């Protein structure tokens, strides 16, 4: 009963955002709670955040 069907493949580029669910490998789940600026993060002695 179908004359023709056209199938279109959308492609999207999601980004890590404040509701995803990252997780380590030892079962230590977690939902990203905030995307801080580079500054607010705590940085070790020689600058690297």
């Amino acid at each position: 009963g179908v004359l023709k069907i056209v199938k279109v493949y959308l492609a999207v580029k999601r980004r890590i955002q404040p509701g995803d669910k990252m997780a380590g490998r030892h079962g230590n789940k977690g939902v990203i709670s905030k995307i801080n600026p580079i500054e607010d993060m705590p940085y070790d002695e020689n600058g690297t955040p």
Binding site: P37, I38, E39
Partner: protein, 223 residues
């Protein structure tokens, strides 16, 4: 009771990218205050010249792939996003690149322009493997601050690439003791910035000082 004003005593270029500046004199307490304020303000509020739009000739949409170039289009955009350029004067500017022949496609062979200057020509953009394969592209560049992805700012060959407008990538401040100077307790504040070369240390530190001075002058008068 007096407060010794600071001055930019030295700007030594230890390396092409990263450098260190020294502030002196500073009094007790002021050291860490200024150091943290400058780190925080520098790491965000700066002008850059990161690419924003790319238009490759024989590329329809991003997720396709051209011929004669091992890199996929997405890798090409990634490298261009990593490209660093020093642009003066003109707000936004277009660059061209039509390298042909086998070998690297490093930024050096980008078409020459005026005040635009490629700081790091060695940074590879893509690769060519087939002799009769040419990659012709127009790369737009504007100047901005912080981070502005494709979607927020939003033909078909107009490949949008996420901005990364920022010249600095690691700011660290240390406070140490200065010379006797007939007065102890004077702090030398050494601030090292690891920048992609687009911005010199003096310009960056002075712009940070200016922005903080304006923000605080907004505090001088209150109702």
């Amino acid at each position: 009771t007096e407060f010794l004003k600071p001055r930019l005593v030295d700007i030594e270029q230890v390396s092409s990218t990263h450098a260190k500046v020294t502030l002196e004199p500073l009094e007790r307490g002021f050291g860490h205050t200024l150091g943290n304020a400058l780190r925080r303000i520098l790491l965000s509020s700066m002008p850059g010249c990161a690419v924003t739009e790319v238009e490759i000739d024989g590329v329809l949409h991003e997720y396709s792939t051209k011929e004669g170039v091992q890199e996929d289009i997405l890798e090409i955009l990634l490298n261009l996003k990593g490209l660093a350029v020093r642009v003066q004067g003109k707000d936004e500017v277009i660059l061209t690149l039509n390298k042909s022949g086998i070998g690297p496609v490093t930024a050096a062979d980008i078409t020459h322009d005026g005040d635009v200057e490629i700081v790091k020509p060695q940074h590879v953009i893509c690769h060519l493997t087939d002799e009769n394969a040419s990659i012709s592209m127009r790369i737009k560049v504007q100047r901005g601050r912080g981070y502005v992805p494709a979607s927020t700012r939003i033909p078909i060959g107009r490949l949008l690439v996420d901005a990364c407008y920022s010249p600095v990538e690691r700011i660290a401040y240390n406070v140490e003791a200065a010379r006797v100077e007939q007065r102890t307790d004077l702090d030398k504040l050494v601030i090292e910035m690891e920048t992609n070369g687009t911005i010199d240390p003096e310009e960056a530190i002075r712009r940070a000082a200016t922005i903080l001075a304006e923000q605080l002058e907004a505090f001088v008068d209150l109702a």
